[PDB]
Amino acid sequence: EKTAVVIDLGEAFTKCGFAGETGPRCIIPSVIKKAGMPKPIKVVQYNINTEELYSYLKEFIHILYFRHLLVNPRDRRVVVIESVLCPSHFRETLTRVLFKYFEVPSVLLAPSHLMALLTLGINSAMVLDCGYRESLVLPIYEGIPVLNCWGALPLGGKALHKELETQLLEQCTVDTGAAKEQSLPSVMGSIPEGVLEDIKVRTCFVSDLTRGLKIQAAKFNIDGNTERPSPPPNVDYPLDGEKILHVLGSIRDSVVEILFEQDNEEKSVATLILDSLMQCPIDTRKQLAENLVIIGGTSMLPGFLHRLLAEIRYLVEKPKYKKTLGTKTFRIHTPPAKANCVAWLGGAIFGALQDILGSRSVSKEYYNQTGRIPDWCSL
Amino acid sequence: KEKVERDRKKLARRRNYMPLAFSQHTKEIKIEPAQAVDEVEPLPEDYYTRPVNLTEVTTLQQRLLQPDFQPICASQLYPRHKHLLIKRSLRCRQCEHNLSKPEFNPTSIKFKIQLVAVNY
Amino acid sequence: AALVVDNGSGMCKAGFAGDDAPRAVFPSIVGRPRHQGVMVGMGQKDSYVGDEAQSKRGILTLKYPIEHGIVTNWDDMEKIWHHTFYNELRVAPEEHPVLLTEAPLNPKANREKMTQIMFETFNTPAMYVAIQAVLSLYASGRTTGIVMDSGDGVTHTVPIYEGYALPHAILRLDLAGRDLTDYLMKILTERGYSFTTTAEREIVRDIKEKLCYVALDFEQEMATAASSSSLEKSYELPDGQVITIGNERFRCPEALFQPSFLGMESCGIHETTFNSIMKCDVDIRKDLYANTVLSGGTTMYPGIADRMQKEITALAPSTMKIKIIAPPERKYSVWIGGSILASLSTFQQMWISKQEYDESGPSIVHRKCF
Amino acid sequence: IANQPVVIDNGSGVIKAGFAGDQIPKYCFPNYVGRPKHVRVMAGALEGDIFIGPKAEEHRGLLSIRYPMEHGIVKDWNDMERIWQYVYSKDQLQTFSEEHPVLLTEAPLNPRKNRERAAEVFFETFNVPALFISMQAVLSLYATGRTTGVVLDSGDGVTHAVPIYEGFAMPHSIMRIDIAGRDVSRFLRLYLRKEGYDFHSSSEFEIVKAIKERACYLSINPQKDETLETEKAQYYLPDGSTIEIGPSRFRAPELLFRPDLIGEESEGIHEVLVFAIQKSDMDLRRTLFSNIVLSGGSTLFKGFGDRLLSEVKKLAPKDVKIRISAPQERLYSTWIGGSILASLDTFKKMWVSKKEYEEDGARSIHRKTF
């Protein structure tokens, strides 16, 4: 047998490499540069025609299997990591591309949350997945994902990128280099997603709960006269060479707060753990609480894990969660690989198990015969 | 253990003896599970009231090229080995062979079997 | 060298003959997971059993294989016996002969199919089925006297005088520990604390065992429960959440003494014990009043013996002296009897062999049962 | 006071109000409190911080929906007081609560604290002449006009099966499971995300309930419809955008009849009906199968009666007549029953007067319930 390849198709970035390795070999933006198109189209797009999606995935998988990885597709197996409740037609297409065009031996559709649990070694743990599109949580108890007690909110990368763009356009101060030393607002109508992502990573950080709670009430201005903490210094960011955008200190520590803002509904990234944990079985409560896992690149943002764990323990004392989750000890697990590449590492650890892989995985001979991929929906 | 269990279960179904007890039925490796920290390290108080040089911190593109330990600072970021390129050979569905390349494709523009639509 | 294996509906007590207490005591349950179409993680057992299923209650649907001392699912019971011999006891069933326990006045198919498995599946050298009540007397070193062996599955009253049992005087009542556990859920749901799932029912059994106690005067206890909050005790769940059960503490075990609460329309555990003695011969009644034994874990309720004495004394004549026999080890009263029986050299002859089973069939058990 | 009594159904999803004289409930509005989604500091926004029923439906996308009652139990009492205050508003009824007496319809086997607090509010906050808490099941029979009948009342919050024979309800044969219409709405949202349409917001949960109510058919065989390629019927949203539901349409409400699929440990809607009949005495079983009544909104699913009949038949004994008599007004059946009950002169005796509650104590409401 040969070392099975692991792919993990995401909206922002795709993880790729081989099984039984310390981390992924290639990690790249999930896009393709088609002739005529100035900006490259995104390879994973939900709610489009199958033929157009088929062509994009055919183009992308080709780049992964030749330019990034150097190996024959037909020779060795595949371990496709994809999140639970991934759209039906997308997963059906992705398999149909691998089985028909590339003619792979067998694909294994592992849920990202159960794979993240294997990397630690613990059999039972709560898993939060703060991705690009949606920040999803799914309790895993001793190998069994509990779909009953699922939770998701659109407070990921996309929702954060959009919030940054909005704030920058309000307090817009750019030095074009054409008598634009004076503050010039909205010279460009929209900012490209590639720039916004680079600003987010380098400039913006996650504030402490004490400082963050003041920032929330400050921008609200709820019958108070200038009750904001002192912001960090303003950082100057180059746009397309000559144009120098002066990023305000307030924007850096306020952009993140949309994730941890209550917004009346009581629906934050913090609340989603406690909302799910309260809905879980009464016996499983204390085991899941003690074993928390924080995957996804959105949680890589500096000082996110401290704010989350703090915001949890504050929301615990709130009267809604005070009865059930009152006297619970919330402890976070530190996975071996980085927060972005926890999902991938599980699939590699699973891919190394040649004996179990072949049995669980769906063979091409079965797919060609039936034409029915197994899912958590009815058969 | 699961393979042996699945094999034993499968050969029992294939036999179709209804689990007939002819003979008597029935070293361990134990990993310690990772310890959960009570409080994760907070964001350093330096980040508050300090000028951020965009030269010192690394962009996403150059962060992600070193995935095993993608470092925020530039001083940590080490140079990775150069990525090897591929020499493609085409094979059809109905037909067998089609075209291919030599064993010394480095500094060579020769095809072992030249085949193209413009050449027929 | 011989094995005693009590097949109780609540807990399966198994061990070696001659030993003081049973070696392995685990809850008699099979844990099948609430699996979706999503793939399962590693270290996955298709069906968990006993202490393993008791650890992994959260996800697994707990299904008791024996219902009212009748084996409903035999495939499940086979998996428990496989966990009993091979894993729990660490002994081959082919080597040692196995003594099992059946409740009195059970269906004939139960004893028939029980022994068939032991002889064919496990290939045991000898197999003897015994009445749980008959064994329970040996524990107290008493040949004479009636027993009120109330289990999780059933409660039965077997009067035995001078080492001779009265079969027609035997009375069976379906009211037992599991019905009380089911009753306790309903009245806890009336207070506020809702328990629905099979895993939650197991937590309600832990609440029952620890807090619940038998009241001497129920009407007097309800008056004190209403006025003062002295009887109200707190219990911590597996979750940090704590609950204050209140009057429902002593309301649960009352159902034993008056089944009207459960709504069975039957005689109480006190009244059935009296009725059984009255069905017996007039002469021997004296000793049965003097030697009334309480066996099983449904007679480990704090102050059942005091309430039992009071209720029997009222029904029984005034001149008679009513003594209730409550030994410290009531839970293991069925097994400890089995250990004494199996050890005795006389019992060596009473064993049913494979040769005897092969020639006659499984019907031989009905002749050599009791 | 002789003035006409006000019937009010405490439906988790939709509360139905009106006078006892009316043949149908004039005022029935959704049971949820509407507050502005964005925390309003500024002027020119939604004022009051309270939007109930038709006002909420108008400005739905702007507000944040919070249901005060979950699984037939009141979680937030402050919210429920505002809802009952809106029942006695200028919008609906337009009367004094102090003048007219009241009839509540609490689900069976609810917490006793739920009934006690419900009475306290209606006696203290509103100055009611008299109050009477009743079972939802018992009312449903008055509406149809038959004494005997099992009532499978599938509401939004709770689905319960109560067998009543010749005006006698067996309280032990009652069966209650939490998997109701609201859970079907929750599971449909999950399958809609599996089709690739997110409804993350609490306002966006309301349109999932509308999608369910509009287009969701129960297939007689679920396995055949899954293999068959769907039409993918388009539904139009409030904004104007179209969504192709496809296979999610039929495999969402299936979770009523088979709740193990998602991973919820419950019996199922076909099972609770049969179990409730089988739990009752053997003589009545035939008549209870011969008289089944569907109540509530979570029976109006297209081909519910067709599936239930088939699923009941295979579980029920062979060659037994099974008549599932659904009225045309299933959603409003529970209220019509109360409206008839309230009109009768016997109701005058049944309810508890305000002075009675002050003198007798707390028990007064509980003891007069039945």
Ligand SMILES: Nc1ncnc2c1ncn2[C@@H]1O[C@H](COP(=O)(O)OP(=O)(O)OP(=O)(O)O)[C@@H](O)[C@H]1O
């Ligand atoms: N200390 C206790 N106090 C009250 N109830 C108890 C106590 N211990 C156990 N119980 C209850 O009574 C039952 C006793 O079961 P036990 O361990 O005696 O096995 P069993 O299945 O009843 O066996 P057998 O029928 O042979 O006696 C338990 O299932 C539990 O519900």
Ligand SMILES: Nc1ncnc2c1ncn2[C@@H]1O[C@H](COP(=O)(O)OP(=O)(O)O)[C@@H](O)[C@H]1O
């Ligand atoms: N190393 C990093 N540091 C900070 N932010 C990151 C880092 N890597 C990714 N991110 C951000 O978090 C997001 C993570 O998305 P990702 O989990 O890779 O995608 P998906 O959820 O589709 O699998 C990216 O879109 C990016 O904005």
Ligand SMILES: Nc1ncnc2c1ncn2[C@@H]1O[C@H](COP(=O)(O)OP(=O)(O)O)[C@@H](O)[C@H]1O
């Ligand atoms: N026509 C319909 N088709 C399908 N489901 C419906 C229909 N009407 C109502 N429902 C469902 O039933 C619920 C109404 O329950 P309802 O009968 O008001 O309960 P209750 O008896 O507790 O008042 C709605 O919230 C919805 O989920």
Ligand SMILES: [Zn+2]
């Ligand atoms: Zn060809």
